[PDB]
Amino acid sequence: MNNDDYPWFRKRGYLHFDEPVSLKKAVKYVSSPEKIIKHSFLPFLSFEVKSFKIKKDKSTKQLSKTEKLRPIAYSSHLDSHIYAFYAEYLTGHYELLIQENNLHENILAFRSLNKSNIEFAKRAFDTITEMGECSAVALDLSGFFDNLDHQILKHQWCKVIGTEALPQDHFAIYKSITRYSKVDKNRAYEILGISKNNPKYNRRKICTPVDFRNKIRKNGLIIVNNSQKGIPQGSPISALLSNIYMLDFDIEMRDYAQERGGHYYRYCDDMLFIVPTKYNKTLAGDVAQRIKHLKVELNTKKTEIRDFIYKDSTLVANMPLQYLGFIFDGSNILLRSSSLARYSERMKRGVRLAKATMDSKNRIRENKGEALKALFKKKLYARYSHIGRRNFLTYGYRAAKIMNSKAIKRQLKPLQKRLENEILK
DNA sequence: GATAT
RNA sequence: GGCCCUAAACAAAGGUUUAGGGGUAUUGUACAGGUUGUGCAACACUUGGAUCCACGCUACUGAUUACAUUACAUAUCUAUGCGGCGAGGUUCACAAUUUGUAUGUACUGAUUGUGGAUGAGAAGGUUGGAGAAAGACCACUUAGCCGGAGGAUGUGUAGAAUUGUCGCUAUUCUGUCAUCCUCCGGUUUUGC
Ligand SMILES: [K+]
Ligand SMILES: [Mg+2]
């Protein structure tokens, strides 16, 4: 068989409770609804992604940093092929309801639009440019994937497929994705005696089925979502279900913005309203009142309101608007400062590791009577300078080309000499 | 490998 | 202890409890069973040509049958750019001669062959194993940025820059020029 006829099939790289399968067995298995009705779903494996925000106070320069935790849960190989196949089925029915309601340009994330974040941010900044004096209201949903109510998700799933109730294979998948069960990966590796430093060594699955049934389940390692809300982040079906859940609210928010002569955009849980200035104080309370039917809440700490006025002939914002990795002040478009900061930390760690490897092999050349060598820097230039083809600078120059910004080019210009000075440091 | 959530 | 199957009990719910069983890597050969023709063929489906013939092709079923071979998500960009040349040796363990001896044996240096490892374009540490050695394997670990203003100093449409090195490409820069110092402002804007 050929993968090109079956776009849902992807081979995945992690270890789980079962082994990777071939295209022939996946295609024969997932196409039978009786197999889906009789399937034995394995638990998800789970861990937390760690993130830090550092924010010194600008009055007295005191340290403050906050740890942020994102719970992540990923499914087994055969389960991941079942979810990908049914997400492929649900996407075609979802896109027809997108085209019916003219929502094609409002809903941005997780759709195969052949567009990136640069084009979405460019479209938002061109709307403010055409609209003139206006306000941008930015809203964020609080705990989006963890707070989806299961009955609302079931009702939205029946409308997309167009039935009164879910069929049996769809209902089995809905049961597995809502009342899900998960096993903590570190506890499983501790109990089974698997090294956290090298797990794929002389094994192709985490354990035997006897070892699963005796050591995993009887030790209490399976934790079941018995609350009435939440779906796991890390399944192949979850992002589509997050788009399906929000559809009627997207229709209502497009109508609300269009009544007032404005525009509406949503990228996952990130929402942008571009409205005339007289509505900008009411808007967050109107959106907080109409989203209570979805049982999800706005994160009121993350609300940002910006205002654009003409100063001379140039449109000027009172503070710059951040949107999808870019900064816009009314005329100029810049990259986020945190993306350039992240590039700087990655570059410095790479150069420091290259110097450590240089020192390590120079000791060996001294021991065996060979002449010392300098720093090899093909890989450093491929990773961290413009000669590379798949790095941060190709993204930056691509963004400077698309958005027509000399300011992005002036941001990217000192990065060559900083890499050279870090090498000479 | 790079970007957005 | 979630999930699936079987059986029972209470009843009729997209049910609860008890008891027992289970978790399909890959590619083939046997073996076992269905549906059917007249013991031993035949088996699926999209599609084409005139029920029949043919192409594509998951080829009646087998995880619950044997045997054997082979080895974090979604969307987007792109797939450490490609190709020559370094390389003579060094090290470790055996084996065969000969180098100096004692009595073929017991030592000792060097030449000659076979096998492990290694230079090559940066994946770091440890008195930790294994090992004949290994640069390999196993075990345990590993304020910053952006915008603006003032200065001080240098400098100028073809040329410059970029990997151990060369070639073919490719990308970036070129007076709102570069490095460094000072001041002001921003950073709900960092997915292990
Ligand atoms: K080369
Ligand atoms: Mg926001």
SS3 string of chain A?
CCHHHCCCCCCCCCCCCCCCCCHHHHHHHHCCHHHHHCCCCCCEEEEEEEEEEECCCCCCCCCCEEEEEEEEEECCHHHHHHHHHHHHHHHHHHHHHHHHCCCCCCECCCCCCCCCHHHHHHHHHHHHHHHCCEEEEEEEEECCCCCCEHHHHHHHHHHHHCCCCCCHHHHHHHHHHHCCEEEEHHHHHHHHCCCCCCCCCCCCCCCCHHHHHHHHHCCCCEEECCCCECCCECECCHHHHHHHHCHHHHHHHHHHHHHCCCEEEEECCEEEEEECHHHCCCHHHHHHHHCCCCCCEECHHHCEEEEEEEECCEEEECCCEEECCEEECCCCEEECHHHHHHHHHHHHHHHHHHHHHHHHHHHHHHHCCCCCCCCCCHHHHHHHCCCCCCCHHHHHHHHHHHHCCHHHHHHHCCHHHHHHHHHHC
Report the C-alpha gap between A391 and A380 in whole angstroms: 11
CA neighbor of A253 nearest in space, from A265, A241, A239, A243:
A265
Say how many Å lie between the CA of residue A382 and the centre of ligand 1: 14
Say which experimental method was used: cryo-EM
Ligand 1 centroid to Cα of residue A301, in Å, is 54
Distance A111 CA to C43 C1' (A): 44
| Ligand 1 centroid – CA A425 distance (Å) | 27
Which ligand gives the minimal distance to the CA of A323?
2
Of all ligands present, the nearest one to the C-alpha of A378 is 1
Cβ burial of A249 (10 Å; 0-12, 13-18, 19+) is: middle
Rounded to the nearest angstrom, the distance between the alpha carbon of A144 and the centre of ligand 1 is 50
Asked if strand B contacts A267 at the CB level, meaning under 7 A, the answer is yes
Q: Name residues 147-206 of chain A with a Cβ under 7 Å from nucleic strand C.
A: 154, 165-168, 171-172, 175-176, 179, 181, 195-198, 201, 204
A385 sits within 7 Å of strand B by its CB: no
Which tokens go with A28?
Answer: 């024969």
> What CA dihedral angle connects A188, A194, A198 and A203, to 10 degrees?
-100
Which nucleotide is the nearest neighbour of A120, by CA and C1'?
A: B4
Ligand 1 centroid to A386 CA: how many Å?
19
Looking at the CA of A136, which ligand is closest?
2
The resolution of the experimental structure, rounded to one decimal in Å, is 2.9
Query: What value does the CA radius of gyration of chain A take, rounded to a whole number of Å?
Result: 26
CATH for the A105-145+247-323 domain, from 3.30.1360, 3.40.50, 3.30.70, 1.10.3470: 3.30.70
State both tokens at A160. Answer: 């997309």
- Residues, Cβ < 5 Å to ion ligand 2: A 138, 140, 302
Q: Is the CB of A116 under 7 A from strand B?
A: yes
Written as six digits, the tokens of A137 are 């209201």
Q: Output the CA A387–ligand 1 centroid distance in Å.
A: 15
List the one residue out of A152, A108, A147, A383 whose CA is nearest residue A248.
Answer: A152
DSSP bridge partners of A396: none
Strand partners, A311: A314
A375 touches strand C (CB under 7 A): yes
Question: For helices A117-131 and A392-403, what crossing angle results, to 10°?
Answer: 30
Strands A326-328 and A333-335: antiparallel
CB A39 within 8 A of CB A31: no
Rounded-to-integer distance, Cα A304 and Cα A115, Å: 26
Q: In Å, what is the separation between the CA of A417 and the C1' of C182?
A: 23
Residues A73, A176: Cα–Cα separation, whole Å: 13
Please report which ligand is nearest the Cα atom of A325.
2
Q: Say how many Å lie between the CA of residue A355 and the centre of ligand 1.
A: 21
Asked if A342 CB < 7 A from strand B, the reply is: yes
Contact present, A106 and A291 (Cβ < 8 Å): no
The Cα A286–Cα A253 span in angstroms is 10
CA A215 → C1' C30, Å? 38
Question: Quick check: A320 CB within 7 A of strand C?
Answer: yes
CB A108 within 8 A of CB A120: yes
Up-side HSE of residue A86: CA atoms within 13 Å toward CB?
28
Distance in angstroms (rounded) separating the CA atoms of residues A56 and A94: 45
Using CA atoms, how far residue A337 sits from A80, A138, A397, in Å, is 37, 19, 16
Cα A373 to Cα A158: distance, rounded to the nearest angstrom: 67
Measure, in angstroms, how far nucleotide C62 C1' is from residue A149 CA.
43
Q: Which residues contact A85 (CB under 8 A, 6 or more apart)?
A: A8, A30, A31
Task: Determine the distance separating the centroid of ligand 2 and the alpha carbon of A138, expressed in angstroms.
Answer: 6
Q: Is the CB of A378 under 7 A from strand C?
A: yes
How many angstroms is it from A376 CA to the middle of ligand 1?
A: 13
Strand order in the sheet with A44-54: A65-74, A44-54, A181-184, A222-224
Nearest to A392 by CA among A378, A422, A412, A410: A412
Q: Which nucleotides of chain B have an atom under 7 angstroms from any protein CB?
A: 1-5
Reported as half-sphere exposure (CB side, CA atoms, 13 A), residue A80 has a value of: 25
Q: Measure A54 CA to C100 C1' (Å).
A: 77
